[PDB]
Symmetry: D2
Subunit: 300 residues, 4 copies
C-alpha cells in the first residue's frame, strides 16, 4: 500500500534548461537517507510535469524508476496531460518500465462538464495500464473542476478497476473526511496534498501525504507523523507549527515551483537548476531570506 510521506519530486535541470538526469540517483539517495522519504510522485506541478514533452516525461520517469529500484518503496508517475492520447502513452510507458502506480489530473483547458465525462477520461487512461494502481489527482485550484472528490469516488471501482486512491489537494475536509468515511472497505490511499495543514487531514484519516515540502522538511514532517501516531496531538501541533512558520513566511514573499527548486538546492546541496519557462528562477533575495528562515527554525 502507498502510505506515509510521498515527495512530489522536482525535475532537476541544467543551466541550458534541459533535464539534468545525472543527479537523480543522488536525489533518490538523499530522500531515503536524509528526509526519511520512501515514496515519490513524479512529474506533478513540483516536477514541472506538463512543461516537459512526452519524450522528456518518459526519459525522466525511466530515471526515477531505475534509480528508485531497491531504494524507494513506491515511484508513482503523474501521467496527466491535456491530450488523452498523450496520457495513454505515458500510462502504458509507466507500466512498461515498472512504475508502482500512475496518477492523473483532470484535463483543465476544455474542462469535463460532468462527473461521468471526467470518469470516462480517467477510465481510458487507467485502461492503458490495466494492472497498474491508479490514483486521482484532485486539485480544483489548478483545474477549475468543481466536482467533489467524495462524489467522484462513489462507485468508482465499477468504472476504473485499478483505482487505488486519491491525492487530495484542497482544504475542504468535509469532502476529504467523507472520502475516508464513505470508502472504508476499499483499502484506498487517502493522500493529503496541502502540506501546510497536514495535521488537520491526519486527524480525519489521511493515510499519507503527497507534497513538495517533503523533499527538504521530511525529517520534521516524519516527527509530526510519529507524534500523531503516538496520540500526542499537542506535540504534533507544535511540529506542524514549525513547518507552518516556514511556509507562511515564504508564501508572503512569493512562493511557487521555482522557489521550491531553489530551496531544495539550498537544503540538499544537489543542484536543481533553473525552472523552465513560464517559470522564472527564484531571486537571490528570496533564496537568502528562505535560507535564514530555515536556519532560525532549525531546518538547516
Amino acid at each position: 500500500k502507498l502510505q506515509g510521506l510521498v515527495a512530489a519530486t522536482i525535475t532537476p535541470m541544467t543551466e541550458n534548461g534541459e533535464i539534468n538526469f545525472s543527479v537523480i540517483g543522488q536525489y533518490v539517495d538523499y530522500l531515503v537517507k536524509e528526509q526519511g522519504v520512501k515514496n515519490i510522485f513524479v512529474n506533478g506541478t513540483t516536477g514541472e510535469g506538463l512543461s516537459l514533452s512526452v519524450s522528456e516525461r518518459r526519459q525522466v520517469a525511466e530515471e526515477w524508476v531505475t534509480k528508485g529500484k531497491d531504494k524507494l518503496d513506491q515511484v508513482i508517475i503523474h501521467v496527466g496531460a491535456l491530450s488523452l492520447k498523450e496520457s495513454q502513452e505515458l500510462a502504458q510507458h509507466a507500466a512498461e518500465i515498472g512504475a508502482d502506480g500512475i496518477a492523473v489530473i483532470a484535463p483543465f483547458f476544455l474542462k469535463p462538464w460532468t462527473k461521468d465525462i471526467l470518469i470516462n477520461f480517467l477510465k481510458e487512461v487507467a485502461a492503458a495500464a490495466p494492472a497498474l494502481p491508479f490514483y486521482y489527482y484532485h486539485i480544483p485550484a489548478l483545474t477549475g473542476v468543481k466536482i467533489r472528490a467524495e462524489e467522484l469516488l462513489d462507485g468508482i471501482l465499477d468504472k476504473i478497476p485499478t483505482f487505488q486512491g486519491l491525492k487530495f489537494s484542497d482544504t475542504d475536509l468535509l469532502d476529504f473526511g467523507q472520502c475516508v468515511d464513505q470508502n472504508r472497505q476499499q483499502q484506498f490511499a487517502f493522500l493529503f496534498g496541502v502540506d501546510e495543514q497536514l495535521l488537520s487531514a491526519l486527524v480525519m484519516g489521511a493515510t499519507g501525504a503527497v507534497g513538495s515540502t517533503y523533499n527538504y522538511l521530511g525529517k520534521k514532517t516524519n516527527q509530526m507523523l510519529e507524534a500523531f501516531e503516538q496520540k500526542d496531538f499537542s506535540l504534533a501541533l507544535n511540529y506542524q507549527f514549525c513547518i507552518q512558520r516556514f511556509i507562511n513566511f515564504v508564501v508572503k514573499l512569493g512562493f511557487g515551483v521555482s522557489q521550491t527548486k531553489a530551496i531544495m538546492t539550498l537544503v540538499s546541496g544537489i543542484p536543481m537548476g533553473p525552472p523552465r519557462l513560464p517559470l522564472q528562477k527564484a531571486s537571490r533575495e528570496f533564496t537568502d531570506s528562505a535560507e535564514a528562515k530555515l536556519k532560525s527554525l532549525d531546518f538547516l
Copy 2:
C-alpha cells in the same frame, strides 16, 4: 471571563408575516442551555439574518437575547457589523448599553477595504463605540469576498484595537487559522472556528471553541465530541465528527443555507423559527422531510 466552547449562531425567529417573533426567544435560550448544553450565543450573524434586519430590529432583538440570556447563558455576543460605519457604531454603543458580553464585526463588503490597515481602522472605530466590551473579528471570506488573511489582521492588533479579544474564523484555510493560534500565544484570545462540519480538524490546530449554526440542534452531539477531545479519546471524537459530517454532507447536496437551518431548528426543537426574510426563501417540504429522515437514521432525532 473567556469566550470558549460552543457558541450557537442564533436564528432570528420570525412570524409568518416576516416580523421578528420575540415571544419565543426565552424558550429558545432555555432549549439551548438544557437540551444542547450551549452556554454562549452569537446574535445577528449570518444564521440570524442579521444584515437583513433594520437597525431598530437589530437593537430590539439584541435586547431580548441579552435579557432572556441573563443568569442562563455565560455569554451573549452581538454581531454589530454593518455596511455603514455609523450604523455599526450605533449598534456597538447599544450592545454596551444593554450589557452584552461582547461584540463582533464582519468586514464591510459593499466597498471592500483595500488593505489590512484600512480594515483595522474601520474595526477600530466600531470597537471604540463600546470601549469596555470584548471585540471579536468575524472572518468569512466566502461571503464578503475580502481577501485579507486573519493572521495578518491579528498581528499587533491590540495596539489599534485595545478591546480585541478574538476571532470567529469561518474559512477552511488552516495555515491562516493555525498561524492565528501559533503567533498570538500571550494575548489570551478566543480562537473560535466557524466551519462546523470540520470542527475536529480545527480543534487539532488549537481552536478554543466554535461558533456555528449546527450547535442550535446538534450542540449536545458536538459537546460529546469536545468532551472526547478533552479526554484524549481521539478515536471517539473522530467517530462523532464523522456522524455530524454524514448529516451535513447529506443536506449540503440538497441545497443547505440559512433557510434550511431555520427549518431544521423548527423540526428538532419544536420552537417555531418561522420563514426567512427575502432574499432567502423558505425551505421546501421535501428538504425538511429528507433532513428529518437523515437525522433519525443517525440517532440525532428520535423515531
Copy 3:
C-alpha cells in the same frame, strides 16, 4: 424618458465625516453647466450609498431632489440595501419627495438562489413606491449574483409594473444586446454602466449611461455621445480613446471611489471631502499622478 449621461454622484463630506449638504447645490450647477449632465444617480457605489445610514440616505436624497428642481431632468435614487425593510423605507421616501425614479441592487449578503426569489425582493421594494419608475442595478462583480440580465427582465412587468429599465454594469454585451433586442415594445431605459467602454454599448443600443466619470469628463463624453448620434464613428472612437487613456492610467495606480472623490475635487474645485471608512482618502502620489495625466489629455 431617462436618457443620455447620468452622473453617479459623489457624497460630499466634511473633514469630520458628516455629509456636506452645503455644496450639493454647487455640485448640481457644475454638472449642468460644466459637464452637460442633466441626470443623476444618487447613493450608488460612487455616492458611498450603503456606507451611509438610512437617515443620511433620506437627508441627502432630499438635498439632491431639492437642488435638482428645474435644473436636472431626472434624479434617480438608489434605494438598495441588504435589509428589505430599509430598502422599502427608502423607496417610499423617494416617492414622497418626488424623485424621478428608484434603483435597486440585488442584496449581496445572503444572495438570492434564483431569479424568482430576486424578483420577489425587487417587487416588494418597488411596491413601496408603486407609481415611481423602477430600475434594476445589475452589477454581478459586486453582488456575485450570476443570473443574466436578459433572463431577469423576461416577463418582469408581470411582477413589477413600475419597471422602466436597468443600469447594466457588466461587459457581457451578448446579455446587454439581448436586453435591448428582446424588449422593444416596453420603452425601457437600457443604461450602460461601464464608462471606459461606453461606445461599445452605444452601438449595441444603449439609451444612456450611468457612471462616475461623467462628474468630471462629462463634456468629453457628451462630445463622444454626439459623434455617435450623428454617425461619426471615427470621431466617437477617438473621443472614447481620450477617456480610456485616462481611465487605463488611473486603474493601474489603484482606482476606486476614494480616488474618484479626489479627482472630482481636483477638477471641479468643489470640496468632496474625505471618503468614509472602509474607504481611505486618496494618496498624494495618486492625485499628483492623476492631475498630471488629466493635464496631458486636456481634461484640466
Copy 4:
C-alpha cells in the same frame, strides 16, 4: 499580406472512433471559401480541440490544412501553443517548414507566468523557432486564468518579438482591447476580436477582423454585418448582429461549447465533423434538433 476580416477557428473533424478525419478537410476548405466567404483559418485553437491532440496529430492536421488551403485560402494560421515550451517550439518550427502563413500562441496555464515579462520570454522562444513567420498572441483569460492584460503585453512587444503581428482577443474587456488598438497605431497589427456574439461592439472599438467558431457556419451572415459596418450602415449592422445574437444566446442557455459547435457545423454544412474527444462529450440529438429549428427560424439555413 495582412490578416484581416473573418478568420474561422476551424473544427478538427473526427471519425466515430475519435481519430482525425483528414479526408474531409479539402471539402471543408472549399465550403468555407464558397458558402461562408471565409478566406482565413485559425487551426488547432480551442474550436479545433488543439490541446486535446498529440503533437504528431497537430502536425499532421496542420499539414492537411496548409496543403488543402493552397490557392484557396488567403491565410492559414496555426495555433502552436502548448504547456510545454519544447512542444510549442516543435510545432512552430513545423509550421514554418510546411509554409503556414502564421503562428499563434496561447499563454501556458499549468504553471502560470507571474509577470508580463516572463510570459513574453516564453512567447519569444516560441516565435524564435519560426523566425520569419508572423506571430499572433492568443488572449483567452476565461480559459487560461492568466491575468495579464493584452495591452500591457503588446507595449513595446516588437523589441522582444520581432515577428509580432497581432492579437486574437477572446475577452469582453474592451478597455484592454481598445487600448491595444489605440496604443499601437504605428504597428499595422491585426486586432482580431474573439467574441463572435458581440463582434459589432469590437468593430466600433477598432477591430480589424475577427477569429471565431461561428464563422464556420454563420460566415456569410457575419460578412453582411462587416459590409454594413464598412459601408457606414450602422443600423443595418446592428440588425444583423442581433439576428446572430438570437441564435448564439439560444445555444448559450442550453450549454454551448466546442461539442455543440461540431454538431452545428455538421448540421449546417453537411460535412461530418464527428464527435469531440474526451473530456468533451458529443452534443445530444435534442440539442442538434433545437439548434436546427432555431437556425431555420432566423433564416440561417
